[PDB]
Amino acid sequence: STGSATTTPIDSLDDAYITPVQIGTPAQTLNLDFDTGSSDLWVFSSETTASEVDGQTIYTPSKSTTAKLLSGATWSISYGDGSSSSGDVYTDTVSVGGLTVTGQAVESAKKVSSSFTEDSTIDGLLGLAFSTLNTVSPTQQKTFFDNAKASLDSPVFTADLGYHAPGTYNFGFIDTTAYTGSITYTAVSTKQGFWEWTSTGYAVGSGTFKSTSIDGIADTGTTLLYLPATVVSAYWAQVSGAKSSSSVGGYVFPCSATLPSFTFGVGSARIVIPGDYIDFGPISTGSSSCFGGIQSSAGIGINIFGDVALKAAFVVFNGATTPTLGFASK
């Protein structure tokens, strides 16, 4: 089997991407944030504290003839950005772009933190990291990809995120028309539960490539590119007026600037992030100070190849016995 679904930016800045997901019988379609940095499929629901719902579409398990309460199971998650959610668990039928899993754990939120409430465009998350990170207790549950894997034509999924435009998540096949050149594959460590790999270096604009190992995670659920302070400083030094602002919480730059590209290495291959991808717009409405899309990972504890990086590539998440990651230009 295979599946194919369009993923759409939630706003004009590509702050996140939503992908429609069919849950239950009859289908209830929710727009989920596909997150390769976490491993829970959770949804706003009829069980969510009413005051914490503000425009999201909810899953109502009582209206699904295939929903079954997973007795005694609860979940609770906290994300790198400080947000959180928690609740109980059903199993139900879940379909993405034509690919169906029966008996998928659907984690129904009873509580969500303010940032989820405040974002009316995201109805929940669909985790695509390794199932070892799944928070369901007392019996850990598998991700949608883990449940689908054996049935897929090939045990892979691909992320093709657009810049200011829709893109595609594919399951079970590689669309050879969706990228240019070849796909370069690189080793993955699953020891922390992430799609963790080592970039071979970077360049700023038309500058020379610096060969240096950068360990980080391919994370579709993080907006920006988080890299070591040395790398980030080298990037922003090429932008007149750019500075790290403690009060704003990262590097800012004059909105009048033309940003240089940023290149990262995948083995001997190179992925070029155009400058415009690094502009996240005014820090506050009407400001001429703009927020940068490359920021320091110092204090996160890990480097994160988030959407800013991934959207410059066609990315293969290869879930073979020994997982690998593939990157192609597009």
Side-chain angles (χ1 to χ4, degrees), residues 1-62 64-67 69-109 112-141 143-148 150-190 192-242 244-330:
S1 62
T2 63
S4 182
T6 298
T7 193
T8 301
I10 62 158
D11 62 24
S12 66
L13 297 175
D14 298 348
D15 280 318
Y17 298 77
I18 53 174
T19 308
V21 177
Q22 282 69 53
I23 308 176
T25 310
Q28 301 180 39
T29 299
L30 274 66
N31 296 326
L32 302 188
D33 186 350
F34 282 25
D35 182 12
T36 63
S38 70
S39 304
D40 285 52
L41 194 175
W42 76 261
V43 299
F44 277 79
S45 72
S46 55
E47 300 176 333
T48 310
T49 300
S51 62
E52 291 177 358
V53 183
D54 186 6
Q56 297 82 12
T57 296
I58 60 163
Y59 170 57
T60 302
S62 70
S64 177
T65 57
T66 41
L69 183 64
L70 187 61
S71 184
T74 58
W75 64 279
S76 180
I77 191 160
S78 304
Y79 298 99
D81 69 351
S83 70
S84 61
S85 50
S86 66
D88 57 14
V89 187
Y90 293 81
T91 56
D92 209 342
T93 303
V94 173
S95 302
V96 177
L99 171 66
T100 302
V101 169
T102 58
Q104 174 67 44
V106 176
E107 300 171 37
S108 166
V112 304
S113 69
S114 58
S115 66
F116 286 115
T117 300
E118 289 160 1
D119 182 7
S120 66
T121 74
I122 289 176
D123 302 324
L125 268 64
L126 191 149
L128 293 167
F130 293 86
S131 291
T132 52
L133 297 177
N134 176 268
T135 77
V136 178
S137 180
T139 307
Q140 259 204 334
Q141 301 294 305
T143 68
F144 174 79
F145 178 55
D146 223 330
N147 281 322
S151 305
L152 296 174
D153 291 358
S154 179
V156 303
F157 68 93
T158 65
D160 178 13
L161 303 180
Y163 167 68
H164 292 354
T168 306
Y169 281 102
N170 291 327
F171 292 81
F173 72 105
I174 286 159
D175 179 359
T176 62
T177 71
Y179 58 87
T180 63
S182 65
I183 306 176
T184 297
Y185 290 87
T186 197
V188 166
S189 174
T190 63
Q192 292 190 85
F194 300 123
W195 293 91
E196 186 169 2
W197 64 290
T198 300
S199 172
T200 47
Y202 70 95
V204 177
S206 60
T208 59
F209 188 82
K210 175 74 167 181
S211 291
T212 185
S213 294
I214 305 170
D215 236 86
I217 66 171
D219 184 1
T220 58
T222 289
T223 313
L224 306 186
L225 173 51
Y226 296 86
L227 295 170
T230 50
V231 178
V232 177
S233 180
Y235 179 81
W236 289 108
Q238 298 302 310
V239 180
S240 297
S244 182
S245 171
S246 161
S247 60
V248 175
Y251 280 90
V252 298
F253 69 93
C255 292
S256 63
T258 299
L259 299 177
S261 64
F262 185 90
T263 299
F264 65 93
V266 181
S268 60
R270 307 287 179 254
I271 301 295
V272 182
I273 306 169
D276 288 354
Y277 289 26
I278 299 162
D279 187 342
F280 279 73
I283 61 170
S284 288
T285 304
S287 181
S288 67
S289 181
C290 272
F291 199 65
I294 296 175
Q295 298 291 349
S296 178
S297 66
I300 297 175
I302 196 160
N303 300 305
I304 307 172
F305 292 88
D307 299 335
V308 164
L310 304 182
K311 77 177 75 171
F314 178 88
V315 189
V316 181
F317 295 79
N318 171 22
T321 303
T322 300
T324 63
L325 276 168
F327 292 82
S329 295
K330 65 187 187 192

